[PDB]
Design a protein around this ligand. Sequence first.
Ligand SMILES: [Mg+2]
Ligand SMILES: [Mg+2]
Ligand SMILES: [Mg+2]
Ligand SMILES: [Mg+2]
Ligand SMILES: [Mg+2]
Ligand SMILES: [Mg+2]
Ligand SMILES: [Mg+2]
Ligand SMILES: [Mg+2]
Ligand SMILES: [Mg+2]
Ligand SMILES: [Mg+2]
Ligand SMILES: [Mg+2]
Ligand SMILES: [Mg+2]
Ligand SMILES: [Mg+2]
Ligand SMILES: [Mg+2]
Ligand SMILES: [Mg+2]
Ligand SMILES: [Mg+2]
Ligand SMILES: [Mg+2]
Ligand SMILES: [Mg+2]
Ligand SMILES: [Mg+2]
Ligand SMILES: [Mg+2]
Ligand SMILES: [Mg+2]
Ligand SMILES: [Mg+2]
Ligand SMILES: [Mg+2]
Ligand SMILES: [Mg+2]
Ligand SMILES: [Mg+2]
Ligand SMILES: [Mg+2]
Ligand SMILES: [Mg+2]
Ligand SMILES: [Mg+2]
Ligand SMILES: [Mg+2]
Ligand SMILES: [Mg+2]
Ligand SMILES: [Mg+2]
Ligand SMILES: [Mg+2]
Ligand SMILES: [Mg+2]
Ligand SMILES: [Mg+2]
Ligand SMILES: [Mg+2]
Ligand SMILES: [Mg+2]
Ligand SMILES: [Mg+2]
Ligand SMILES: [Mg+2]
Ligand SMILES: [Mg+2]
Ligand SMILES: [Mg+2]
Ligand SMILES: [Mg+2]
Ligand SMILES: [Mg+2]
Ligand SMILES: [Mg+2]
Ligand SMILES: [Mg+2]
Ligand SMILES: [Mg+2]
Ligand SMILES: [Mg+2]
Ligand SMILES: [Mg+2]
Ligand SMILES: [Mg+2]
Ligand SMILES: [Mg+2]
Ligand SMILES: [Mg+2]
Ligand SMILES: [Mg+2]
Ligand SMILES: [Mg+2]
Ligand SMILES: [Mg+2]
Ligand SMILES: [Mg+2]
Ligand SMILES: [Mg+2]
Ligand SMILES: [Mg+2]
Ligand SMILES: [Mg+2]
Ligand SMILES: [Mg+2]
Ligand SMILES: [Mg+2]
Ligand SMILES: [Mg+2]
Ligand SMILES: [Mg+2]
Ligand code: NA
Lengths: 92, 54
Amino acid sequence: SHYDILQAPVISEKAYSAMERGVYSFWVSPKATKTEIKDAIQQAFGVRVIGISTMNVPGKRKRVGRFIGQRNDRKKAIVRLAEGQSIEALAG
Amino acid sequence: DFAKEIDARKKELMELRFQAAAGQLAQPHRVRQLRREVAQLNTVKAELARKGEQ
RNA sequence: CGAGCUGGAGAUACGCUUUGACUCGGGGAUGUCCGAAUGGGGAAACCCACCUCGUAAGAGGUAUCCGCAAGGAUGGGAACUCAGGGAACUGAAACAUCUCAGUACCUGAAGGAGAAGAAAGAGAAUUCGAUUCCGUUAGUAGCGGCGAGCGAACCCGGAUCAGCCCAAACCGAAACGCUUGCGUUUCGGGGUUGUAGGACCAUCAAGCCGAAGUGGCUGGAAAGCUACACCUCAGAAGGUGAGAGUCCUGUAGGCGAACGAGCCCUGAGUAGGUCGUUGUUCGUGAAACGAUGACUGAAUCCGCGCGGACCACCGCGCAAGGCUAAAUACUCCCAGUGACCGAUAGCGCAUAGUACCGUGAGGG
RNA sequence: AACGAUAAAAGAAGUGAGAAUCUUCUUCGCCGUAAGGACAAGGGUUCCUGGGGAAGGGUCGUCCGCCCAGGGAAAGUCGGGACCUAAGGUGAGGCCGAACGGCGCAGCCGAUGGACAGCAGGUCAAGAUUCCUGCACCGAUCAUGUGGAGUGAUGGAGGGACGCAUUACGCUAUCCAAUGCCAAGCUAUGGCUAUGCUGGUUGGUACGCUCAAGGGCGAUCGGGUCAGAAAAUCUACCGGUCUGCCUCAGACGUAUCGGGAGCCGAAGUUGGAAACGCGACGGUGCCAAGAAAAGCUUCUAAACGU
Ligand SMILES: [Mg+2]
Ligand SMILES: [Mg+2]
Ligand SMILES: [Mg+2]
Ligand SMILES: [Mg+2]
Ligand SMILES: [Mg+2]
Ligand SMILES: [Mg+2]
Ligand SMILES: [Mg+2]
Ligand SMILES: [Mg+2]
Ligand SMILES: [Mg+2]
Ligand SMILES: [Mg+2]
Ligand SMILES: [Mg+2]
Ligand SMILES: [Mg+2]
Ligand SMILES: [Mg+2]
Ligand SMILES: [Mg+2]
Ligand SMILES: [Mg+2]
Ligand SMILES: [Mg+2]
Ligand SMILES: [Mg+2]
Ligand SMILES: [Mg+2]
Ligand SMILES: [Mg+2]
Ligand SMILES: [Mg+2]
Ligand SMILES: [Mg+2]
Ligand SMILES: [Mg+2]
Ligand SMILES: [Mg+2]
Ligand SMILES: [Mg+2]
Ligand SMILES: [Mg+2]
Ligand SMILES: [Mg+2]
Ligand SMILES: [Mg+2]
Ligand SMILES: [Mg+2]
Ligand SMILES: [Mg+2]
Ligand SMILES: [Mg+2]
Ligand SMILES: [Mg+2]
Ligand SMILES: [Mg+2]
Ligand SMILES: [Mg+2]
Ligand SMILES: [Mg+2]
Ligand SMILES: [Mg+2]
Ligand SMILES: [Mg+2]
Ligand SMILES: [Mg+2]
Ligand SMILES: [Mg+2]
Ligand SMILES: [Mg+2]
Ligand SMILES: [Mg+2]
Ligand SMILES: [Mg+2]
Ligand SMILES: [Mg+2]
Ligand SMILES: [Mg+2]
Ligand SMILES: [Mg+2]
Ligand SMILES: [Mg+2]
Ligand SMILES: [Mg+2]
Ligand SMILES: [Mg+2]
Ligand SMILES: [Mg+2]
Ligand SMILES: [Mg+2]
Ligand SMILES: [Mg+2]
Ligand SMILES: [Mg+2]
Ligand SMILES: [Mg+2]
Ligand SMILES: [Mg+2]
Ligand SMILES: [Mg+2]
Ligand SMILES: [Mg+2]
Ligand SMILES: [Mg+2]
Ligand SMILES: [Mg+2]
Ligand SMILES: [Mg+2]
Ligand SMILES: [Mg+2]
Ligand SMILES: [Mg+2]
Ligand SMILES: [Mg+2]
Ligand code: NA
């Protein structure tokens, strides 16, 4: 259910500095909405969510082998928690 | 209880996916094994649907 | 099946497998969104809902037309079938009739085929005996600005052959219909036609088993040369460092599974007619017959239709109800084969409806 | 032949195998109702970072809108949808038609229009009414309390609801002057010793017995059935009935959050100009006579209570 809505954490120098603000950034399945994405984050990590934002992101159009390539297509979501700002501590 | 048996493999597949996005995915096979165990665990449910109820 | 496997993928890490993996044959179960699309909307694959399940996450339903209801339909198919429509270049050495041709094209319906089919026929022997297909008749008979040109059928020989049931005269109803044992449509029995009948009265599958050769020589390499052998129901073929009957896969032959596919009546707004037309060889011709668009409109078995205006005689047949396998066509798909190609050939493609061109249809 | 406008370029310094062409510095020339800036269509990663140098670049190339990889894109309040309607498109029933199809009321779709709640700043290498800080507003559900009863529809009414030209008053944006204020230093060339030169010289919000042009409005008691389907305490008709209220554009003050030249934070004055923007749906004239629907305000019908 909730486990496989969440995709994989963003790994970005910008996203990791936000890690220090209590802000957490990770990709999700694009067809999901904010309401379910929030209850997914907080069913999974046990923490109140007070701020969501989301954004569809096109797949880059890479080309291998001189066969023109395609997109990939994602939906990064950024989330701010309550003052109980822990996750799994797994930040680095 | 079978939903309980399923979501444990789901959560391990999620945290393992996170690890794959980071710097450590040293046993890729544990991925598809877990996915196997989900499919099996659902396929067995199908066999208790038609069985009994007819 | 019996050691490999982890798609092409050729690149590692990771594993899985003799409690049988992988691969092959056969079933199940999952099956996002669009698309007949069908909950409502929509610029396909995206927006927006409602109702019961209801703990949630998730599931199930919500189009229309047929029908009480089950249950059915809608869409999609390379060509093939039938149907509703229906060209023109062209030929006629110009062009109107005519041809091209009921060809192309469009549209509808259906299937593995389809159509057609069981004589009011063909036809001239008082012969024949449903339909379709092939041969021949025969380019004959005919049609035709009697020009260009178009062009049958019967007999006969073959492929395959099967014939079948309803309506109605009369029984018995029931319901309704009216002056009193009747007649409009349902349901049974009965009854289905021309030598007139009938009523009422006396094997293919996945696969498994499968014979026979060694030494020297040339050579990078043996399958070639050579010398001695051997099998043969098996010398079809492909692979193997170059040309292999006896090295491999195979071949002739043999076996081969749980589930697997497969032969008093006999039809009326009709038959018939006048007007317009048309189909078969049928172009208004002496033009019958079938066919409907308009208006009319019969007869019963001593009766009805036809036999190419029409009449008499003589013959053939029973219309206005339905179903019907097989011989026929085609080739998206599979197998085999080839005095077919072998890289400007062969399909457009040794793969691509791609790149590329176009607003598009479309081309490529 | 050409190398795509006759808007010039020069030197120094750097990087590199390599430099007229890449980077830096200092000058020069060109646009400036543009050749600057912000959007819509359309394009689709062209954006930023780090690398590269085949080809693409009309030369070169260490560079690029080219190639490789990694990041970047945040909304209750902006634009669209979950609201409305226009032309147009659809369209159960319905009207037609050899077939396919052609029309068509209601209804539905359809923005180029209507309705609708946020402003100031900060700032990644790359996002900003979106993230952050300050401080607001809007709908919905619930709770506490006041209130302690009427709510008041797929239906009625009002209203939304609209032309063109011209133009009175007031104002802001915004622009100018100065021996106003504030900050910084210097000066030479012949002079000025600052009365010179240079630069900056306020944004949002909250509260005012503050100043203020302009703009909106009449208002109830009752009669009639024949009007709005019936209803109606709301509208429309008709009859009786007596300058003043509201609004702040904007300015001013106080406070506060910001910003501010600059070496953390100074000043925030007086005088003048001025919009097509705002007050506003103002005034006047004219003929060619200037959308609809929802939201919104008001009434009962049914139902639910009191
Ligand atoms: Mg937010
Ligand atoms: Mg095997
Ligand atoms: Mg391989
Ligand atoms: Mg739909
Ligand atoms: Mg549908
Ligand atoms: Mg359905
Ligand atoms: Mg002609
Ligand atoms: Mg001719
Ligand atoms: Mg002609
Ligand atoms: Mg054809
Ligand atoms: Mg067709
Ligand atoms: Mg069809
Ligand atoms: Mg014969
Ligand atoms: Mg051989
Ligand atoms: Mg030999
Ligand atoms: Mg008969
Ligand atoms: Mg007739
Ligand atoms: Mg005639
Ligand atoms: Mg003639
Ligand atoms: Mg006759
Ligand atoms: Mg006739
Ligand atoms: Mg005769
Ligand atoms: Mg050849
Ligand atoms: Mg070729
Ligand atoms: Mg060639
Ligand atoms: Mg082609
Ligand atoms: Mg194009
Ligand atoms: Mg194109
Ligand atoms: Mg030139
Ligand atoms: Mg230079
Ligand atoms: Mg050097
Ligand atoms: Mg060089
Ligand atoms: Mg130059
Ligand atoms: Mg440059
Ligand atoms: Mg320097
Ligand atoms: Mg510009
Ligand atoms: Mg765009
Ligand atoms: Mg974009
Ligand atoms: Mg750039
Ligand atoms: Mg850069
Ligand atoms: Mg770069
Ligand atoms: Mg180069
Ligand atoms: Mg290269
Ligand atoms: Mg070059
Ligand atoms: Mg958003
Ligand atoms: Mg906010
Ligand atoms: Mg809006
Ligand atoms: Mg609408
Ligand atoms: Mg209309
Ligand atoms: Mg229409
Ligand atoms: Mg608009
Ligand atoms: Mg708004
Ligand atoms: Mg910065
Ligand atoms: Mg930018
Ligand atoms: Mg901002
Ligand atoms: Mg003025
Ligand atoms: Mg002065
Ligand atoms: Mg000054
Ligand atoms: Mg009231
Ligand atoms: Mg002041
Ligand atoms: Mg409406
Ligand atoms: Na001096």
